[PDB]
């Protein structure tokens, strides 16, 4: 197919419904009950048969309202450029990243796109964010989910950043661009800049990029505590 | 066209929306960054103009709510039902926030609006009454959409000001009842303040039908509940 991105995950619909069952029954049973058939149907309806490069935030409002990415106060974890580590940290400390919310869990690691005049997914290729269009259903999903995740944050939240990069805070990242500026006001944020096993840090809490982050948080009336110069192992020990 | 049961659209609706948006974003609650009030007003108009006033859906307000979500800091939220004036004077004095203190709630408070298919203008003549005409009207749908997100957004300790004075301080069919209470997140703690007129005595209290009503809803959602009754209008304020 013509897009520069990999095609939709095979059997997407089955995966998201089975993941929904597993999540609602065995991961976060609670609660209030949710219909996973309805959630799957809402997920498909958001993007199926639509122009794969005209995704808007508004296409996802209904899906999100069925299961907002809300995490109990003091359990929320943000991350940027630290995928593996942040999730290991969350899993071990019993915390929740975006990928641990119902909708994040459904979509984590999946790919999807549709095609006008078709009720099927495009399993051949999907729009690439850089080569094709930013406004694609995969990228917009994560942007909008990220935004609501940031909005619903409460009490103490933590963020895991990459101390082996020149700028641990990337203002063009999803964290920098969508999450930090939408963080609920008056929450408290603790940041951990963590470096490879490995090697001396390339960024710190005193670096320019973190000062940029503090400036955004000052604006959101968010108290900020930053810790750095820790290796992955040292971090996971504290 | 004057066929509906409800008062027509507020005259100057568009001007009023723009003025209030400027006031809110510049003088009341300046944000950490700017919101484009022209864009907000355009989105508000586009939601309903030239549409069947009885075919409103929540989706019609997606763009608008995305421009200005009615969310606020934990512990800040004041809910109300049948206690508008009291609740708002309460909120003001304690520097808390009702829905009407959010950007969109502030824009829309006390206004009416509806359109008519094939017309680019508001219907100044009449608009659908939510009882006598249709529930799916742009005025009722707006408040339900806003109310739901505001309730969703609540965290830590939040409060609701009830009246009674009424045989049922908690009306299960009010917006608070259908839409707010049932959308509070688990572990949120709701304080209910049953305030009678003062005024001769009450009519309802933290014991009654109406509450086993509310409390029941909170239970089963995992919302903690504190009910303070036997309070007057002067005590409370
Ligand atoms: N500012 C407002 O006009 C407003 C309207 C509706 C709802 N709210 C939000 O919900 C709560 C109050 O609504 P309520 O229905 O619990 O309280 P009432 O005093 O019973 O009603 C307030 C106004 O809403 C109207 N109302 C109630 N149900 C509907 C409906 N289904 N459709 C249109 N209007 C309705 C009602 O007639 C009254 O003028 C309050 O916490 C606030 F957050 C605000
Ligand atoms: C900080 O960022 C770097 C760059 O992304 C990460 O290193 C990559 O990690 C992946 C996943 O293990 C490897 O497959 C790549 O080979 C690595 N790329 C490079 C350029 O080294 C690193 O894991 C991050 N560090 C922390 C502490 O999260
Ligand atoms: C409880 O409900 C009653 C009835 O709505 C409220 O009384 C009204 O208040 C307004 C504003 O002062 C008056 O103009 C109306 O005449 C009143 N209506 C009736 C039927 O009395 C009363 O304000 C509410 N009490 C509290 C504590 O909010």
Numbering used by the authors:
A (entry chain A): 40 to 277
B (entry chain B): 39 to 275
Structure paper excerpt:
Next we replaced NAD+ with 2′-deoxy-2′-β-D-fluororibofuranoside NAD+ (rFNAD), a close (bioisosteric) structural analog carrying a fluorine atom at position 2′ of the ribose moiety linked to nicotinamide (N-ribose). Using this strategy, we were able to trap a non-covalent complex between the E218Q mutant and rFNAD and its structure was solved at 1.94 Å. Despite the presence of two CD38 molecules in the asymmetric unit of E218Q mutant of bCD38, the structure of the non-covalent complex with rFNAD revealed that only one site is fully occupied; it is possible that one of the monomer and active site are rendered less accessible and/or reactive due to crystalline packing constraints. In particular the ribose from the adenosine part is well-resolved in density. This NAD+ analog is constrained by the enzyme in a somewhat folded conformation and is stabilized in the active site by extensive interactions. The electron density maps show that the nicotinamide ring of rFNAD is buried in the active site in agreement with the experimental observation that the cleavage of the nicotinamide-ribosyl bond is the first step of catalysis. Thus, the N7 atom of its carboxamide group is hydrogen bonded to Oε1 of the carboxylate group of Glu138 (d = 2.7 Å) and Asp147 (at a suboptimal distance = 3.3 Å). Upon formation of the Michaelis complex, this hydration network is disrupted and displaced by the binding of the N-ribose moiety of the ligand. As shown in Figure 4A in the rFNAD/E218Q complex the 2′-deoxy-2′-fluororibose linked to nicotinamide is fixed in the active site through efficient hydrogen bonds between its 3′-OH group, which displaces a bound water molecule, and the Oε1 atom of the mutant residue Gln218 (d = 2.7 Å) and backbone NH group of Trp118 (d = 2.9 Å).
